[PDB]
Structure formats: C-alpha cells, structure tokens
Design an enzyme around this catalytic site. Structure first.
Site, PDB file in Angstrom:
ATOM      1  N   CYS A 130      32.780  51.580  34.556  1.00  0.00           N
ATOM      2  CA  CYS A 130      31.612  50.967  33.909  1.00  0.00           C
ATOM      3  C   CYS A 130      30.524  50.408  34.840  1.00  0.00           C
ATOM      4  CB  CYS A 130      32.012  49.936  32.844  1.00  0.00           C
ATOM      5  SG  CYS A 130      32.853  48.470  33.466  1.00  0.00           S
ATOM      6  N   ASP A 160      26.092  47.717  26.635  1.00  0.00           N
ATOM      7  CA  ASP A 160      27.511  47.872  27.001  1.00  0.00           C
ATOM      8  C   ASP A 160      27.829  49.358  27.209  1.00  0.00           C
ATOM      9  OD1 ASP A 160      30.316  48.164  26.937  1.00  0.00           O
ATOM     10  OD2 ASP A 160      30.546  46.616  25.400  1.00  0.00           O
ATOM     11  N   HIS A 167      30.634  51.039  27.611  1.00  0.00           N
ATOM     12  CA  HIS A 167      32.000  51.479  27.323  1.00  0.00           C
ATOM     13  C   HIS A 167      32.162  52.505  26.205  1.00  0.00           C
ATOM     14  CE1 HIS A 167      34.561  48.223  29.525  1.00  0.00           C
ATOM     15  NE2 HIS A 167      33.516  48.591  30.241  1.00  0.00           N
TER      16      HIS A 167
END
EC number: 3.4.22.-
Length: 210
Positions: free
Chosen positions: A47, A169, A171
């Site tokens: 990430c 984010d 992910h």
C-alpha cells in the site's frame, strides 16, 4: 494497451459539514492506484507503493511516467537505501522511501513531516490549509503502526473547528467501476481527524509540491 485507472475520484463527494467554516481541496489531477491495479498482487504489503504511485500521477493525472513496484524497489536498491534482494521482495515502504523515490524519478517534490502524539493534526492544520491553497498535491500518510498508507486530498472544518480530512485508501482489490463505487464504500471519503490520526500514535506525512 494502456493502464486505465480512475481519475479524480473524490469529485462528487458531499462536504462532511452542514456549514464548513474553511475548505481546501487539492488542485491538479491524480489517479487511483490500489492493490493489484496493474496485475501485481501486493495485498498485505504494497500500500505504501500504491499511495506513492498516486503521488507520482499528480498533477497531470497520468500513468505513463509512473514507475511500477519492481522499478520502485530497484531504485531503493540502486540508491543504497535497501539491501540487494529488495527488488522482488514483499517488504513494505513508507514516507521516507517515498520521498527518496520521488526525487529519483523526478516526481513532485516530497517534503517530510513527523506528527508525534497529540491533539488533532498536532498543529499542522494551518500548514495543510496553506498547502492545498498554494497548489500543493496529495499528502501521503505512512502506514507505520496502523498498517494502512493513505493519501490526504483536502481539509475542512466545522463551526467549532473540528477538522475533517479527505482520505484516499489504496487497499481496494478488484476492478473499481467508477468513483461512485469508491465513494459509496468509503475508499475515498471525508473522515474526522480524531479518527484518522489516533492521539496515541505517531504519523509521518509526505507533502508533495510542484
């Protein structure tokens, strides 16, 4: 033939306040990089690289000069920041490595900032407003001690100066259809600073500028 990533995915999100006293969003354009978006399965460790790729995509919102994960790892090896074998490894990276890679690949300039334990953004609220107002880019938040790299894209506050930040984010696993899907599930969204930045944790930021 070409990597088709989603652009400017925060557009259309509602303000998190009824009446915001201040609001600053980044200018320029960026692409949403995320786990496996280019075919490499980096779930659980990639990430920081994905957030870094998003930074590299700004302000043009272009993927053509954005290095892949192997190239990023290879750069860190070449610079002597990581030992031989790092390229091909499943090792995570954070803000320190991101700042070094930005310089190596001629990306936007990456200025580091450390947030210790403390209230809110620990006094960096004004810096963040000024940053976005003066043409600043996405701000990387390292994934140390929470295992979640994030990019910050904006800042606003309510009447009592409770601050919200616009968080991206990386992910997501799969192929996101559009920005609405990302917004509905909260992959991009406003969050209270109190919840993003736990007062008992330390955070590293990497501000991008061009």
């Amino acid at each position: 033939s070409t990597l088709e990533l989603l652009k400017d995915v925060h557009l259309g999100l509602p303000v998190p306040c009824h009446d915001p006293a201040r609001l600053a969003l980044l200018s320029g354009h960026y692409l949403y990089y995320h786990y496996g978006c280019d075919g490499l399965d980096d779930r659980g460790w990639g990430c920081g690289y994905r957030t870094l790729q998003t930074l590299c995509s700004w302000p043009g919102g272009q993927s053509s000069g954005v290095p892949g994960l192997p190239a990023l790892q290879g750069a860190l090896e070449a610079m002597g920041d990581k030992p031989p074998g790092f390229r091909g490894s499943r090792n995570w990276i954070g803000c320190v490595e991101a700042s070094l890679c930005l310089e190596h690949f001629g990306g936007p300039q990456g200025r580091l900032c450390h947030l210790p334990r403390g209230v809110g953004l620990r006094g960096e609220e004004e810096r963040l407003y000024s940053h976005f107002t003066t043409g600043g880019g996405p701000v990387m938040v390292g994934g140390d001690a929470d295992a979640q790299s994030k990019a910050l894209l904006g800042i606003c506050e309510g009447p009592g100066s409770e601050v919200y930040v616009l968080i991206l984010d990386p992910h997501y696993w799969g192929t996101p259809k559009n920005r609405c899907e990302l917004q509905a599930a909260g992959w991009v969204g406003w969050q209270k600073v109190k919840s993003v930045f736990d007062s008992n944790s330390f955070y590293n930021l990497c501000f991008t500028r061009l």
